[PDB]
Design a protein around this ligand. Structure first.
Ligand code: HEM
Ligand code: HEM
Ligand SMILES: C[C@H](O)[C@H](O)[C@H]1CNc2nc(N)[nH]c(=O)c2N1
Ligand SMILES: C[C@H](O)[C@H](O)[C@H]1CNc2nc(N)[nH]c(=O)c2N1
Ligand SMILES: CCCc1cc(C)cc(N)n1
Ligand SMILES: CCCc1cc(C)cc(N)n1
Lengths: 413, 413
């Protein structure tokens, strides 16, 4: 049958049948095992790889408007033989392109999925060295950035073979700031990247002890020890934070990178695994203004901006935190828009996702969604998405989390 | 063992062992069967009632600091015999008081649980007629209201016997406004109570076609047809909405009842079920300002307040919805505080719940929590609760939802 889903805002009902294809209640758990695809030391068993491969080949060929059975049956034949003769198989570029968009399409934590069909794919499956990973990463950052007119892209490195030759990016994001535990008890920069910053120092990276120090790319190639590479500052576009009214906002000396790029996820498709496949899209205002700037475990600027606004920062009931965070979000949006850097505010994003959800239900009878992540960190019920009942499930292709590399890596030297 | 829970704000770790006592992923489903205890036509089977009764008696007696084994063993004896001789059993007043607070304690959707130990219990288990239910309900509303100094209370009516004599309140809340489908296409009042308002009209209630018409109590006594009773206006305390700066706010002619009282839930305890046990606490600002006033399926005042604030109400990116909703929340809080009606803002509530959670983990190794409901409808990440990982589970005693009565009732006449 199906599962009835209701939108309490519009009163609309949808019928979810897509969940039938997935694979006590841990609700708000950030990194659950169900969303994580770990390491291996031995190749994927053939009895598992084959049915998974076949299923993907059928999905891929079954995605065209006008079916191409001749080519479909031929691919099934060749794939089976390649697995038989080599122990694994290589996807064609079109299958990879299809796989990367589908995985994005299947990302339950992404509110920007209406753009799923627009994705640039850089094939780095022939990559061999750390230096080469680095060159691809630079080409990626440069293409995606496009001088502010952000373009969604993904770079695919070699697939996992036996699990002892994994290509991995130790960074959580391509571009991110360093976090320092200054002497005076106060953390400087981005407190989220504290443990990682130290790791970069252990590998010889030169600390510049600032609030916005762009960290280096830490690349692991073919299972070998990671190599440190600084990102050419020319490639890192940034936005100066300016409020369109409180001229004292600049006096805060705030800024943020224009490129949100995930660096540590794993792409699973047709039984294959890609431990390294960095991808980016464009920012949604609240990520920066609310999470990056106001989380107490991040920049924690909230009170400083409060005091500055001349608000009762000692009486919670005054709703000062509410007033401040809104101006910061206004600052962020204002700044990006002025400096011509692509950005989407949370209200527009939500409406866009609601539209995407409607489309997906008619198109394939469902849309895997994680309410907890899809609802903006501010203006909850003020957004459409808040009133939309959702079903969270893992399909395939899919983007999985991975165990942090420093926790499983065997240091050669 | 246990489940590790992490607060990403403070970095604190907690160990949940309490879940061991409970009983694809439907995350954002509002009324799931797991939270609903439906009707019956036959009495609870003895093989089920007894172990459930015994478990509760053991929990109750095992709750005291200094154990009272003599009385504990005697109660087990008497309970067993009462079930043997009568087919069911009556809780003592102390057990009921304990049960109602524990059920509240176990309510995963309640952010106000730090107050669990402060609950007035009105024993109406001897109630017989609709008129009597009504008198108890009036006594409740009056006690709880206390001229604005709100007091948490619950009234327990007779327990379900065979399921064909259920005491039920057809209302969702004790005090609520009517919703009318005016001629000109526009809904008037509270659109949420549309279907119910009609039901009240079918039962003879006199429509007053206003925006704030307090609906009547629809009481079902001893399984019989429901009787309509208007609530004495003297008992219904209200708050006039006034902004401390935008004097034009009053020109909106808004107000809200000071008493949030759930009327349709079922209390389950020791194998017994109470289909009628209305309860109240005090309001949290956002319930009114954000949900009641701004939900499009409710009052939907957002744009009108936007225009009035002289904001760009046609450009989402301007974040006008953000600016407006904050003033409304300021209005609500301001008004209640002035007219001396108890109220809690969402930031204070969240901090209070976080404190309660800490206490509960040390006290009993867990706190059943539903993130989706505990995180305020605005200022999501700005609150502590947003960064707290939570585990949602059903314990016992517990407050369950029930199937709407008009859907299962057999109309005698
Ligand atoms: C085109 C613009 C896009 C927008 C506006 C967008 C927006 C978002 C937002 C707001 C989040 C949550 C951020 C957080 O709280 O960490 C997110 C997460 C995610 N998005 Fe998108 N995204 C876009 C493109 C993409 C692309 C191109 C991919 C993949 C190819 C993608 C994959 C995902 C995944 C897997 C997550 C989850 C990351 C995690 O769990 O930490 N997104 N996206
Ligand atoms: C003392 C003050 C209290 C506060 C501030 C408080 C606050 C809240 C809030 C904000 C909600 C969610 C409202 C909604 O979105 O519908 C709620 C739900 C709930 N609360 Fe409390 N509450 C209080 C007392 C109580 C008491 C005395 C009980 C029970 C004896 C209780 C039982 C629950 C239950 C069962 C729900 C869920 C109702 C539903 O699922 O629709 N609360 N409470
Ligand atoms: C504990 C909770 O899961 C965590 O704080 C969340 C919740 N929702 C989120 N939503 C988004 N989009 N991004 C996040 O990082 C989080 N974190
Ligand atoms: C679909 C979703 O479950 C629904 O809109 C929610 C979510 N969170 C909520 N949270 C609270 N406190 N109250 C609610 O009514 C809801 N409704
Ligand atoms: C890097 C932070 C998380 C993220 C990822 C993507 C793809 C888009 C986006 N806007 N944010
Ligand atoms: C009646 C609306 C829901 C509710 C219930 C309780 C007990 C408290 C509260 N503040 N809100």
């Amino acid at each position: 049958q199906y599962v009835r889903i209701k939108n309490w805002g519009s009163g609309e009902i949808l019928h979810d049948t897509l969940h039938h294809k997935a694979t006590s209640c841990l609700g708000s758990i950030m990194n659950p095992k169900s969303l994580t695809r770990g390491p291996r030391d031995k190749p994927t068993p053939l009895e598992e790889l084959l049915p998974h491969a076949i299923e993907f080949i059928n999905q891929y060929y079954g995605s065209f408007k006008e079916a191409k059975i001749e080519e479909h049956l031929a691919r099934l034949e060749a794939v089976t033989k390649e697995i038989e003769t080599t122990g694994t198989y290589q996807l064609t570029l079109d299958e990879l392109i299809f796989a990367t968009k589908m995985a994005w399409r299947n990302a339950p934590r992404c509110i920007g999925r209406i753009q799923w069909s627009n994705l640039q794919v850089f094939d780095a499956r022939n990559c061999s060295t750390a230096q080469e990973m680095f060159q691809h990463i630079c080409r990626h950052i440069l293409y995606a950035t496009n001088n502010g007119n952000i373009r969604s892209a993904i770079t695919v490195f070699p697939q996992r073979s036996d699990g002892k030759h994994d290509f991995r990016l130790w960074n959580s994001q391509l571009i991110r700031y360093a976090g320092y535990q200054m002497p005076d008890g106060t953390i400087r920069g981005d407190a989220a990247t504290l443990e990682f910053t130290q790791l970069c120092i252990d590998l010889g990276w030169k600390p510049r002890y600032g609030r916005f120090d762009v960290l280096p790319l830490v690349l692991q190639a073919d299972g070998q020890d990671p190599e440190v590479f600084e990102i050419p500052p020319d490639l890192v576009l940034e936005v100066t934070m300016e409020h369109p009214k409180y001229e004292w906002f600049q006096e805060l000396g705030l800024k943020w990178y224009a490129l949100p790029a995930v660096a540590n996820m794993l792409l699973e498709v047709g039984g294959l695994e890609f431990p390294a496949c960095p991808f980016n899209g464009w920012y949604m205002g609240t990520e920066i203004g609310v999470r990056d700037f106001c989380d107490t475990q991040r920049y924690n600027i909230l009170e400083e901006v409060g005091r500055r606004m001349g608000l009762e920062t000692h009486t919670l009931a005054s709703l000062w935190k509410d007033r401040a965070v809104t101006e910061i979000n206004v600052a962020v949006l204002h700044s990006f828009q002025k400096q011509n850097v692509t950005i989407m505010d949370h209200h527009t994003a939500s409406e866009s996702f609601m539209k995407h959800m409607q489309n997906e239900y008619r198109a394939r009878g469902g849309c895997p969604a994680d309410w907890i992540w899809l609802v903006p960190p501010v203006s909850g019920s003020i957004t459409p998405v808040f009133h939309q009942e959702m079903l969270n499930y893992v399909l395939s292709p899919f983007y999985y989390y991975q165990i942090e590399p420093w926790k499983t890596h065997i240091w050669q030297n």
